[PDB]
Design a binder for this molecule. Structure first.
Ligand SMILES: C[N+](C)(C)CCP(=O)(O)O
Ligand SMILES: O=C(O)CCC(=O)C(=O)O
Ligand SMILES: [Fe+2]
Ligand SMILES: [Fe+2]
Lengths: 372, 378
């Protein structure tokens, strides 16, 4: 009834129509938008959903000739083509644009929930996510909503992290390989939270860390929600937030290992309509900020410092241990990671790799369709 | 020019003003200079990585003294009592008090736009893999121009992967490590048909978008099947200059993209057709008629004007004077910066067969390979 069309009027111009639903709500649709979004077999390929026409193919003077609501659907005929198409009621309501578009600068998407140290680490079973699609769905949904999740009871096997990535997507291969070794000896001698690779564009969007061996005390993994840090800055200091979102920083890795990577991106990235979409924060690979005008540099640095203070706040960190066979994924466009200090001697062997979020969301979409 | 003549410090100690030998002035803040110190306690000698956090620098950091000497600036910071030296060349190269352009929709200084008046740049398969100069020049052409042909290559399946391996790494996707561009029954995508394709960037429904694409010819014996490339930055520039409001609509509102071409895949993205940096520099173009999804993020009162701007951009992209056209022969390929340069093909039919192979790679690898080659060759 929210989605059941009742009636329609076409404007005298034919430039738009106004659809009334059974609950009394109205939604206006332009002729050009309706024509471009026609769902019939000659606009959208039945076999693959690809649109068969370009914007150039649609006559510039396209108008609604006539329209009618009947049996839960809208019939519309366009001029000058003479093309008649029908739209289900549910589709029109779901794809409506005649609505109040939220414009709040720095807002998070409704699909994510921000967190601090009160958030327990989401934890899922390695075997369950492979054999139970509901478990797999919930695992990937946790990564989508919260930006991280643990996988426990996995195999103590080299390269197992690559198998984890392959459950939903594909590894971003780099000059270090499809995965890399993180070996640590801790002894008396003795042998900040960040996002990885802000000097890569596009940034690798997921990171996996997988434990094979751990005999050292302490050194718990920590995750910090970049969106929560940014939210706190926005609420306290909107001008400071605007500075970090409104000017690009520079990142560079120029090692002796034959990799020289640079990127020009802001530390807080917004969509053009103000939604917070990414965080880049890494002290080790920050490079000279050449793009910020002189008049803003002092205040930019003050805001940068303040963001760092929120990131350094121990009340923001979620900490956990990785036993052999355990791993975690972070959304590397949002959630920062680090570890706590070691409190005892021993050895550690982790493996690390990157994967991409587009594959994760596709797999999640496919699972939601299969389960719903 | 990069030789410092003299320096003054502000009363607060918050910045200094450096005057060079050509009369030019550049101001540098105390905090920015301290944060960019090049000494072994701020930057690693081994890899150049920064050894401090922003929190480690005292909040009241200020210039206690500054002097010019031997073509360099020596500065002491309070309260650390830390003295560092910056070469004049470094200060000039990394200056931010430069009156940076705020022209909305300007391109990066490192790119050069083009239309049909420039013939396609071409490089040789054997030369780029055997001569480091040729490799550098090839990769640098892709970096600057967003497009290059690689000719005289082998007529061998999977040769495009060897091409990718010359500079970087394959972005493997749902479509495969590489994909077969040929007519398929029950096609999952109109790329796999005999139909002509409007100029487009691949996978605007994928976030992150693949940043490079390789297209490699094995057979092209049918009538038609010509390749065309269009510089999306040139198209965007033309819209910017002709119609500022239209340009602003396409840069300032997200579009939607969606691919659901078979069971087992559902890719969606929410990104503008013209992506700008927050300071107005052009970053990326996303344009693909086949996978543009319903635009739900544009206010009702702006939708008609948005569509008019979209139409106009399409007219620039379809303009034959913007397209660089060629027909690939067996063993020839090209690479596009898939964030910038659009590609197209004319439909094909009749006697003959067409078989291209395609894959994605990433620019970060290309830039690293190029950067390393530039260090080694000069
Ligand atoms: C891999 N592919 C079928 C060539 C993609 C074409 P797009 O859907 O990106 O236009
Ligand atoms: O067939 C061609 O020349 C190009 C097809 C294409 O656009 C693609 O494979 O992405
Ligand atoms: Fe890391
Ligand atoms: Fe394509």
């Amino acid at each position: 009834h929210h989605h059941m069309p009742r009636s329609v009027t076409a404007d005298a111009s034919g430039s738009f129509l106004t659809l009334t639903f059974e609950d009394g709500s109205e939604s206006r649709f332009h002729a050009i938008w309706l024509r471009d979004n026609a769902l019939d077999p000659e606009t959208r390929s039945p076999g693959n959903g690809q649109r068969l026409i370009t914007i150039g193919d649609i006559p510039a003077d396209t108008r609604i000739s006539t329209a009618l609501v009947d049996d839960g659907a809208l019939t519309v005929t366009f001029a000058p083509e003479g093309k008649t198409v029908t739209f289900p009621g549910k589709w029109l309501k779901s794809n409506a644009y005649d609505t109040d578009q939220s414009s709040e600068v720095g807002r998070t998407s409704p699909d994510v929930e921000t967190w601090d140290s009160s958030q327990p680490a989401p934890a899922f079973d390695w075997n369950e996510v492979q054999s139970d699609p509901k478990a797999k769905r919930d695992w990937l949904d946790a990564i989508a909503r919260l930006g991280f999740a643990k996988l426990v009871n996995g195999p103590v096997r080299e390269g197992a992290l690559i198998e984890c990535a392959s459950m939903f997507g594909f590894v971003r291969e780099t000059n270090y390989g499809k995965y890399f070794e993180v070996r640590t000896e801790v002894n008396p001698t003795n042998l900040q939270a960040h996002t990885d690779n802000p000097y890569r564009d596009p940034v690798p969007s997921l990171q996996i860390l997988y434990c094979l061996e751990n005999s050292a005390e302490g050194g718990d993994s920590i995750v910090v929600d970049g969106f929560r840090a940014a939210e706190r800055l926005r609420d306290e200091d909107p001008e400071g937030f605007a500075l970090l979102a409104g000017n690009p920083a520079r990142f560079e890795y120029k090692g002796s290992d034959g990799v020289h990577l640079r990127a020009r991106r802001p530390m807080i990235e917004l969509s053009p309509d103000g939604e917070m979409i990414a965080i880049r924060f890494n002290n080790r690979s920050s490079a000279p900020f050449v793009d910020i005008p002189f008049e803003k540099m002092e205040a930019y640095y003050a805001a940068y410092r303040r963001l760092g203070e929120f990131i350094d706040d121990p009340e923001m960190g979620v900490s956990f241990k990785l036993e052999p066979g355990e791993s975690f994924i972070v959304d590397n466009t949002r959630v920062l990671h680090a570890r706590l200090g070691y409190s005892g001697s021993g050895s550690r062997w982790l493996q690390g790799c990157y994967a991409d979020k587009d594959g994760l969301f596709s797999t999640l979409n496919v699972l939601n369709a299969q389960l719903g």
